[PDB]
Paper text:
This gives core-packing rules, including layers of hydrogen-bonded polar residues, which are combined with surface-charge patterning to design complementary sequences for acidic (A), basic (B), and neutral (N) helices. Next, AlphaFold2 models for both designs are used to seed computational designs of single-chain proteins where the helices are connected by loop building. Synthetic genes for these express in E. coli to yield soluble, monomeric, and thermally stable proteins.
Manual assignment of the subset of 169 structures revealed a strong natural bias: 121 had the anticlockwise topology, and 48 had the clockwise arrangement. Notably, in single-chain proteins, the predominant anticlockwise topology has right-handed helical connectivity consistent with the left-handed supercoiling of CCs. By DeGrado and co-workers, helical wheels suggests an alternative design for the assembly with the opposite (anticlockwise) cyclic order of the three helices, which can be achieved by switching the polarity e = Lys and g = Glu giving an alternative neutral peptide (N′). To do this here, we used MASTER to search the RCSB PDB for loops to connect helices in the AF2 models for the clockwise, apCCTri-BĀN, and anticlockwise, apCCTri-BĀN′, topologies. Based on pLDDT and RMSD, two BĀN and one BĀN′ single-chain designs were chosen to test experimentally. All had consolidated hydrophobic cores with knobs-into-holes packing between the core Leu residues confirmed by Socket2. Moreover, the conformational handedness of the two structures was different and as designed.
Residue numbers in the entry: -2 to 94
């Protein structure tokens, strides 16, 4: 196995746990009406996830250039596309607070 895969798999798992922590941050803010600073804080955390997902596409892209026949290449591209759609769904939910 490649260390390019394991480092990519760990980052895909950590960003899935960062999205789940963002879900719980939304739930708490549906209770307390929240200040603009707290609303701007969850938004800045949302933009940080979009940046990490965008650089991960380049990370996965460098792996395809040096090893296009590596197994899990299709599942890693689909897992990143799901994380991007999951992050965007948290953006629309926040915009209604």
């Amino acid at each position: 196995s490649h260390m390019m895969l394991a480092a990519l798999k760990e980052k895909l798992a950590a960003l899935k746990e960062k999205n789940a922590a963002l879900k719980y941050k939304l739930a708490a803010l549906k209770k307390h009406k929240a200040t603009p600073a707290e609303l701007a804080a969850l938004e800045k955390e949302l933009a940080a996830t979009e940046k990490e997902l965008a650089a991960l596409e380049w990370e996965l892209a460098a792996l395809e250039k040096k090893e296009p026949l590596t197994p899990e290449l299709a599942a890693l591209k689909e897992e990143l596309a799901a994380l991007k759609e999951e992050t965007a769904a948290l953006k629309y939910e926040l915009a209604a607070l």
